[PDB]
Symmetry: D2
Subunit: 392 residues, 4 copies
């Protein structure tokens, strides 16, 4: 097996099959033709019996898919228009009325909204459990439990699950494990190598790395991915990825290892700095020894990531003032960009709501989330330092 | 006030507001930042109230949406990753278990599959009705009837619905009317002017015109479109359109009137040619006086369209031969491209599941569909001519 | 031979050669690799001996070139980063110190500047001649004359050259005739069929049609185009066209016939209208019966074009007021866009060519809207 | 405090752009427009009258290209930037602007092949006099200076041998005599070497190479004084080459520049490991890598370049049969004549670019552009290919 960086650059492509083109040509074409009629029917007989033919599919998307499957260590990939496209296409395929899905206690907002206000209104039953508590997960299992779905680390506090421990429970009961591996990327964590069946990504974030595309990825077995392609994507969401954007995503993936190394190195320094500041009450970073799941983080993730969450002593007011004071960090809801980003859900995504409603799965008044970018660490430190002064 | 071609080129954009740029810049950015968290908060708060906030949405997408709303004569537009993304985002928003949807008798294949194998398996009730039979439609209405959905013209015979008659019925019973207007485009037919509530498009086809993007559009009232944006798109499909592709779609729309004029002119010559030929049993072209719904077609459509369907004497084998002899027309499933396309579903989309399972009857068997392109009509005539000879 | 519209969509490409892709894939790659060193020796043991293989060249650019060569009825095509790229690559290849280039009396501004302040400052001799006056052109030929270069029609009055007449004169001296065919496009005029050796285009204008790319095209005989590729482009300008923009250009070309028909139809209406307005002193539109070169125009052009120039009676102030009143037409210097454009050089390009000269690039908008805009601007010009 | 220059990586990502001026867009929108319109006729006379007199007021300039230019200027420490369709576009637009018949240009002893061809068979055939001088020999340079010497032009390190020049030393001679110094900084990028900060007047790049980093665009950059860059814009580019860069490609070049520091660090780290490994292999006769003390200009390389680059040249024992066999055995390195890509590339000039000629550049010479792949995979490829050349 070539190394990760080699595979991120080369896997699945030989220039000699495309006239020597070092960079694969971009198939910006909505349709492909047939040499004869019966040739065209072999293709569409193939699908609907369950099988996926790679001509009649887009070679640009097929390469992205193959490369992502390689990096995750999985059999098959699927490229979609957004992370939400990946999540919905997957879950719409795998669940029907009467099935139960077991969920991590805290999810990305639109994932939560899709589950509770979307598929959960179509007869699918939902239950949240703490995926770190393997006792409680085992106790929540029923024979109708079809899917276990979580993020690790999860928003907001970077709470982790023991993926291999969850997978053991799933295997005993007969459930499918879907992990949103957006935060880590395959460079830091490979849930399929720990027993998960499927991984989903918002490739909009670190995989792209540059904030210029929206994309999703699914990786898993050929059997599952084919179903998600043929039903979830083709019939239930139509979340088709542009070949232009797939090509830009592959461009980003060529520097994934280098970018993640810098995101993590910057984040570790910033996290250690924040831990020593008088304005800061609590910090959630996997790379600090104080992190409650430090041991599990070191076992499951090869580096502690680019994401930091922390709480300011002065609560929502201090959070607002801190956020407003940032000059180099931008105020924005995304993550995994070259540019450093910050958000303070209490005064941003959840503002008109009351303090008591920010509670059950839970948003601290003072919780700030940082996506630590690729800028010079001294410039980022200076920005954070002044914004902490301004937070009082 | 301004004419269709003027609006397709200019609507919603003045260069003087973007530093004089004659062509609007392409916003290929996954996210937008906020000057304050309070500003950011106000955006997410009103989104949670059900209000869509233009700007802090993507200006490239917003311009495409405004321009399509203008061309269809609707209040609001929505851009999505594919036609299927348009259709699914709409139907997932409008329907819940217990609701019924009345459908046109024949549907595009993935639409059919979505309804019967997708949303229909989540407790939504389906019934097909002839949307030209207002008495059958009235009789099929129930208190659960929430949506009426069809294409006009519809495959394979270009069967027309009586859109104004359907809408009257829908308004009486409180149902929402959704029309897939892909075939005509707003240049030939505007279902919202006939009482439809929503129109959907595979912008992949004629709106693009050049077969290089995949895209969908919804146009209708602000109230309906806002729900579809905020629930169907954001939560249930994630079918997000690339700004690169949105810009190309706008580029295509600038010649829509010209292209549709030529598609219709060419198709009429080919249909009148086909009418005079001994190998042709039957032709479905709205512009021939013998088309069964010629008068209704003319009330709803300003020109008879770019699509022809015809049946060969000799059935499946004659079709197979016709298709394999074509040298200028390509064998492919799409439509609305500059390139002329043909398909014979009996031996392409539907060969392997063979003549017994084609128990639609009047639909299949010997039927060839032409998407008449923009090439020189004498070249297209010669190609059809020689393929007809080869069909014997 | 397939018809123009068929060739603009199909020429040079079969989907069956590229895995069925209806639209050809975009080769957005700077480099191409070799299967063995033996093979990669062939590709540079060949350009060194003046031979262009289609192997280390880009397939997207090659297809665009092939299609443009087909539309102009020439042997070979070359794609470049701009019309100025086409013009300079061509003239740098064909001229050396002491050579003479005979020029149409009026040229696009940057072409004029290139000639007078660029190549003309490196010892190349320039002379301007009326390319409709065949006796004057003949009397201007010298042994140094190596190239005859002009636009037809030319700014500001749409002055026409007699292309076949020029070619006949050139042939007696072996001189190379280069025609800038930007205004007409191959759909309206094909100078190579009238005896020119090379045509150049700012593909930025009508060929693209949509105002979103900058690009140039050269079409001509194989020997000349090869030298322009291997010397002018490769070594003297580096005016390399992006494969992305080449793909967009090909996209524009698929509707060239339909767009030109509408540009011409709209300009015909606006010219009939303007020609009888009180405020209008003179009008230059090839489709008007009273255009001085009506007959020659109709011999060379299948339609009279999308461009109109006219002169307002009230001079520079009238021109200014007209321009500032326009609400649908945009104030800009380009042409050949879907959007209608207007310029008044006396108050725009030339702060200090008539005082009242206005040029319209008539676009694809509804003619009733363009007429209303021009009408109210005319009233405001009083 | 606030008068501290932000770090190189911060500037490569942010310089020149605030999202709040473009409706919050985190990534700047792409101005894929050939033309810009005017609010009145007068606003437009002021722009066109200004460009004639010598000015680059933005002048209704393309904001995508302007941002790229300002960012490249910041990184090189220059006043102004200009973006063009290729490296040759940058080189030709620059030299066509600065030279006229009777002027002399002094040239480094080796040049990129198309640059050599432009000079000898292009501008040199229009009355511009050429002379080649070793730009590392400051005595020889001083002695070659004449009253007609208008431009001194060279690459450092030079294609293909990596010969270096003392840029500050050259600049000092040019100051005394009056010549304009133009340095092709392609190989190093501003991350490794900033010739303007050493006294050069202009720098040019094939941004096609490292600045892009991903082998998908062709592009050139010039950086220097506002006066010289404006002149080159308004004459060389606008009138003499038309080498216009696509806004689409300019945006991709900015995307590449956001990772320039990280990529250059990995190119150099990999090349150092590969150069140290190659130096110890039986079949390697000589190796030229700036980071090895065997490099003939080791101390000049250390002085001018913050890291020793991504390029290696070495000679195999066993001649052309060796090099030919080494090349054809490569399974991860590609056979290609380019550099600064994510993909590692190799060439053997004897069996490739100079194959048409006879031995009468050594016969076992190989040039490597070391990419971003895992070093263990690159070592294994080179090691198995050395076995096959044996």
């Amino acid at each position: 097996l070539p190394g990760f960086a080699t595979r991120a650059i080369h896997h699945g492509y030989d220039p000699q099959d495309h006239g020597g083109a070092l960079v694969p040509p971009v198939y910006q074409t909505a349709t492909f033709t047939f040499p004869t009629v019966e040739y065209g029917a072999a293709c569409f007989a193939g699908e609907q019996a369950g099988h996926f033919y790679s001509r009649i599919s887009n070679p640009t998307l097929n390469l992205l898919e193959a490369r992502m499957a390689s990096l995750e260590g999985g059999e098959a990939g699927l490229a979609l228009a957004s992370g939400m496209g990946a999540i919905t296409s997957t879950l719409w395929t795998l669940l029907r009325p009467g099935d139960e899905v077991l969920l991590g206690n805290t999810l990305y907002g639109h994932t939560f909204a899709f589950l509770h206000h979307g598929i959960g209104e179509f007869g699918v039953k939902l239950r949240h459990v703490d995926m770190a508590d393997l006792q409680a997960l085992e106790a929540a299992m029923t024979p109708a439990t079809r899917v276990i779905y979580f993020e690790s680390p999860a928003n907001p506090n970077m709470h982790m699950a023991d993926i291999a421990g969850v997978a053991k429970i799933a295997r005993k009961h007969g459930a499918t494990v879907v992990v949103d591996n957006t935060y880590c990327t395959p460079y830091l964590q490979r849930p399929l190598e720990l027993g998960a069946d499927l991984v989903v990504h918002s490739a909009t974030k670190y995989l792209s790395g540059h904030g210029d595309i929206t994309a999703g990825i699914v990786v898993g077995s050929q059997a599952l991915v084919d179903r998600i392609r043929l039903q979830g994507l083709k019939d239930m969401t139509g979340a088709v990825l542009s070949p232009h954007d797939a090509a830009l995503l592959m461009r980003g993936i060529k520097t994934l290892n280098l970018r993640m190394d810098r995101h993590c190195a910057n984040a570790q320094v910033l996290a250690e700095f924040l831990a020593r500041q008088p304005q800061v009450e609590l910090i959630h970073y996997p790379g600090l020894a104080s992190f409650p799941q430090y041991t599990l983080a070191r076992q499951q993730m090869s580096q502690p990531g680019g994401m930091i969450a922390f709480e300011l002593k002065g609560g929502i007011g201090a959070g607002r003032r801190f956020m407003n004071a940032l000059q180099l960090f931008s105020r924005a809801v995304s993550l995994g960009d070259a540019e450093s980003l910050a958000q303070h859900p209490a005064s941003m995504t959840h503002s008109s709501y009351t303090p008591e409603e920010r509670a059950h799965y839970g948003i601290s008044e003072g919780l700030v989330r940082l996506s630590v970018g690729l800028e010079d660490i001294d410039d980022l430190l200076a920005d954070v330092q002044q914004a902490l002064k301004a937070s009082a």
